[PDB]
Amino acid sequence: EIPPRYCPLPTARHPDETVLARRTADWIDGFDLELTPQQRARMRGNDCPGFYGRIMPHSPTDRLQLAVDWCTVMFHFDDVHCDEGPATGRAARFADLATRIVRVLEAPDARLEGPGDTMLAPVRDLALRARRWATPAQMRRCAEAHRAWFLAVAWELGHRAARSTPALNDYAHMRQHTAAGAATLAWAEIVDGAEIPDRELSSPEVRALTELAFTTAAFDDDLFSYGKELWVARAEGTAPSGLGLVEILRRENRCGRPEALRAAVCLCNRLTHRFIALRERVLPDASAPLRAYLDHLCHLLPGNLEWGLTADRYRNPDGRTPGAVTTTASRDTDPPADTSPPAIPSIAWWWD
Numbered sequence: 001e002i003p004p005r006y007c008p009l010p011t012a013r014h015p016d017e018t019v020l021a022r023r024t025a026d027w028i029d030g031f032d033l034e035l036t037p038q039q040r041a042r043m044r045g046n047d048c049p050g051f052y053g054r055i056m057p058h059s060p061t062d063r064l065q066l067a068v069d070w071c072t073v074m075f076h077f078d079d080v081h082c083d084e085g086p087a088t089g090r091a092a093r094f095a096d097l098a099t100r101i102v103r104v105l106e107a108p109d110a111r112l113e114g115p116g117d118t119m120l121a122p123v124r125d126l127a128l129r130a131r132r133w134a135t136p137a138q139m140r141r142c143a144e145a146h147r148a149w150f151l152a153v154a155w156e157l158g159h160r161a162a163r164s165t166p167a168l169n170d171y172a173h174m175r176q177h178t179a180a181g182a183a184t185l186a187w188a189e190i191v192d193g194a195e196i197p198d199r200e201l202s203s204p205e206v207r208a209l210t211e212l213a214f215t216t217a218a219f220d221d222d223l224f225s226y227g228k229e230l231w232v233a234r235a236e237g238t239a240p241s242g243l244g245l246v247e248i249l250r251r252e253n254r255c256g257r258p259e260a261l262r263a264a265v266c267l268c269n270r271l272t273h274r275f276i277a278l279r280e281r282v283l284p285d286a287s288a289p290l291r292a293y294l295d296h297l298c299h300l301l302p303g304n305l306e307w308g309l310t311a312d313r314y315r316n317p318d319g320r321t322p323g324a325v326t327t328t329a330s331r332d333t334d335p336p337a338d339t340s341p342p343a344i345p346s347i348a349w350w351w352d
Contacts, residue, residue, distance in 0.1 A: 002223050003262045004332035006269040008276070011302035014053025016061040021049045023065055024072045031121045033076065041319040045312030046075045052187075054303025055296050059191050066129055067187035073122045074180065077101075081119065082153055083160050091157055098150035105143045134190045137198065142190075145182035152177030156243055165242025165251045172215070173346035175245070179221060181214025188296045194289040205282050206290065208350040212275040213297040215347070217304045219245050219268050223261070224308035227325035228317045269336045272301060274350060277339070305329065 014020070025043070029035065035043075048071035056064055081097055083090070097119065100112040104120050108127040113120050131139060156178045159166055166174070176182070189196050200206055222245040229247075233240040240247050245267070250260040279294055286294065308314060309329055316322050341351035 001261075002327060002329040003265040004330035005220070005223075005265055005272075005305065006332045006335060007272050007302050007305060008333070008335075009298050009302045011054055011299060011306050012057040013050065014057045014059070014061075014064065016064075017049040017053050019061055020053065020065060020068045021047075024048060024068050027065075027069050027125075028072050028076070028122065031118065031125075033118050033122075038319055039076075042079070042313075043072060043075065045316060045319060046071075047307065047311045047313070048072050048075065050311065051303070051307045054307055055185075055300050056188060056191060057299065063133070063191045063193070066126065066133075067191055069122070069129075070126055070187055071184070073119070073126070074183075077119060083157055087161070090161070091154065094150075094157060095154060098146075098153070102143050102146050102150065105139070105146060130187075130190055133193060135195045137195055138186070138190050141201075142183070142186045145180075145186045148177050149180040149183045159243055160241070163239075163242070165248055168248050168252050169344055169346050171243075171245065171248050172344045173211075175218045175222070176211055176214035178243070179214065179218035181218060182210070185214070185293075185296065185300070189289060189293060192289065192292050194292070196289040196293055197287060200287060200290045201293075204349075204352065205278060208352070209275060209278055209282060209294065209297065211347070212271055212278065212350050213300060216268055216271040216275060217300055219264065219271070220301070220305050221308060222246060223264060223268070224305065224327050224329070225314050226261075227327050228314045231317055231325050266336070267342060269332065270338065270342060271350075273335050273339060275301070278350075 021044070025040070028043070033039075048068050052064060052067045052071055056067070082094065085093060100110075100114075100120060101123050103110050103112060104123045105127045108124045108131070127139075130142065134142075152174055155174060201210075226244065226246050229240050229244060242248065242251065245264045246257070246260045249255070249263045250257060253260065253263065255263070275297070279298070283291065283294065309327055312319075314327065315325050317324060341348040
């Protein structure tokens with residue numbers, strides 16, 4: 001039971017999810033991943049078309065397919081190449097693969113395949129399709145968003161190998177990157193087909209809006225995937241992972257699980273309010289591509305929640321247990337009473 005979330009933003013579904021699902025399943029099947037039926041079922045439970053369709057419900061299907069296909073292969077990357085394989089040489093293996101992915105995005109004919117490689121062929125295909133539509137700056141943004149994601153995953157793998165729990169001030173600014181927030185959303189302006197001006201994207205107010213949105217969505221992800229984490233921990237007989245806002249607040253405040261859930265939701269509510277309030281100040285002078293970017297972030301927050309609460313990824317985790325985890329949520333219609341910055345110095349500047 002997730003305490004009431006404040007997110008007064010409308011959500012909508014793309015009308016062509018079935019087509020996007022079919023094409024993305026056909027697309028990923030065309031490479032050399034040797035997907036088992038269990039793996040194909042898990043990808044269905046991921047519902048990539050439902051996810052990105054909620055971010056861009058009005059976009060043309062053939063263009064949105066590019067972002068859906070990226071989600072498809074990167075969910076597989078997460079499940080198969082992040083914190084997997086032999087413990088010996090795990091960090092080195094990840095850094096090796098991660099840098100090849102980034103290079104293929106920059107140089108699709110780099111020919112970096114190794115013995116048994118599977119990931120680079122679809123990545124190359126995404127980069128080649130992206131380059132038909134994207135400006136050079138947009139392609140650069142994709143590569144750098146992937147670097148920020150992958151450096152954060154290397155950070156995260158260190159905590160998982162130590163089974164340690166990050167301090168809140170560290171998690172609070174890193175979580176947007178372990179969630180690949182920017183790498184997920186970089187595809188949007190390519191789908192839209194117009195470059196967001198660098199001076200806008202780089203301005204402090206837009207940087208704040210960007211980090212606010214990606215952090216809120218990732219914390220929401222921590223909340224609607226918490227049940228699956230407790231499921232895994234119970235199956236494997238271990239404590240839940242410390243890589244999650246709920247467990248971080250539980251450890252930091254020496255509180256119960258219900259109290260930590262309330263504190264996590266309270267933080268999400270304050271970030272969401274700040275995003276909305278800062279949005280109102282930025283929109284008057286925003287260019288049309290910036291306005292579209294902020295529209296995508298506005299659909300991301302409620303769309304991410306609806307997707308995460310209803311996708312089988314966080315309800316039937318292994319793909320063989322319908323209803324193993326059921327997460328419920330509420331909508332708080334009242335804004336947070338406290339609109340001041342939280343005592344988290346790594347993110348406090350969002351309230352500047």
